Amino acid sequence: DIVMSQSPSSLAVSAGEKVTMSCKSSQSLLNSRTRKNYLAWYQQKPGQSPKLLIYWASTRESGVPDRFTGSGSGTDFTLTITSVQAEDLAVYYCKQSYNLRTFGGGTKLEIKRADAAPTVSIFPPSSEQLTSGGASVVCFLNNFYPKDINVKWKIDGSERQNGVLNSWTDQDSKDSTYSMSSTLTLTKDEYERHNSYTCEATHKTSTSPIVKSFNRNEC
Amino acid sequence: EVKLVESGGGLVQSGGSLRLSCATSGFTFTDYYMSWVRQPPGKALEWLGFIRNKANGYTTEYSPSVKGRFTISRDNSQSILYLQMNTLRAEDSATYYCARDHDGYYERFSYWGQGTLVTVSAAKTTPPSVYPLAPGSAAQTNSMVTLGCLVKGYFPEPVTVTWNSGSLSSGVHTFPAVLQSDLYTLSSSVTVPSSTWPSETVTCNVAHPASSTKVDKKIVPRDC
Ligand SMILES: C=CCO[C@]1(C(=O)O)C[C@@H](O[C@]2(C(=O)O)C[C@@H](O)[C@@H](O)[C@@H]([C@H](O)CO)O2)[C@@H](O)[C@@H]([C@H](O)CO)O1
């Protein structure tokens, strides 16, 4: 086997700054006859298929921005990105093709940006869901940074933790922010026992939580 | 324009078999090696195998991880690549990509398909319920408005969500599904100027290929 390892596993860089990442092969990838290193780099943006950036270690594929440079030889290789852009958010993989093919484990590149507070929206259960006996209350927390955030649900002023489902998006390729959805699911019967439904977001951008609420009796 | 399009992904039980296909166009199929690569959700790419080009007798090689269990073949008349998978296991659940490989001058995977998702599970196919997310009747409406769709209780992945058939793409956040007792739920938000809704229609288009579900859900205001 040829074993491929990458580092770091992940890192975060601000726009305009330089990125360096490494790929190691357990044996030399340098072909004596052709005198090339059979090592390629791929970029895989969130939700996309992988794209080839560099092959033969240092040959930039046509169309690939000049800020991407591959270097190294033998068992050790480097991908350098200068003047990193928000759109460069992705997982980068190296791949050997000296003996069949093997991919490294990937390096996840995140983008650092200025802190931004979330925009919070709350939604009562729809009449179509209630008809079926269920009641989901949804809270969107959009376009914030950093990713770390705390959401609590208060029903009639009291915290509820059971029945919550949280999901974060990948970082945005354009504004480098995150978003999160939080869904509280109750039975129609439990929903109709209480009035006040509140989702409270605490984020480092403010010492006061962002609070969105509605009262069922006033829907 | 070069085209690689995978098909055949879906739900299959442990022990079972599944054949994937990859239809190609925009290049001379026989001049190229073709590879299959997979990727379990949230994990690394894994090369599975290739089939060589015409000059190399269309011979095959496999990763040790799948050799003896997966078979690659190709239809040179139609320019279609196949992957036959047998004795499937949980670890085989993944997105499967076909990729144009070696042309003998170039070490590189130049073109990849969009991928097809295979889920190995005993759980049954369940279509999603799709619910509109409109501000409540105590919405103090302001400059911008955020609407959404809750896509609840389906299996297996994936679902696709668009807004106004694709016309609305900016200001959209589709949240990754999360699995809770054997069913997935996801949501999607869209943000638009208040002047445009509800004066103009906003509709989420949801599809769940495994159940052939197609849903258009119009977001209607709770007064209005
Ligand atoms: C070195 C001997 C013969 O190898 C080649 C050649 O032209 O030199 C290349 C071989 O190609 C592969 C392969 O296994 O098919 C794929 C390439 O991506 C690369 O990995 C090379 C590897 O560097 C070679 O050791 O292998 C193959 O075409 C081979 C013929 O099949 C042999 O009869 O010819």
Ligand SMILES: [Mg+2]
């Ligand atoms: Mg070895």
Ligand SMILES: [Mg+2]
């Ligand atoms: Mg956003």
Ligand SMILES: [Zn+2]
């Ligand atoms: Zn109660």
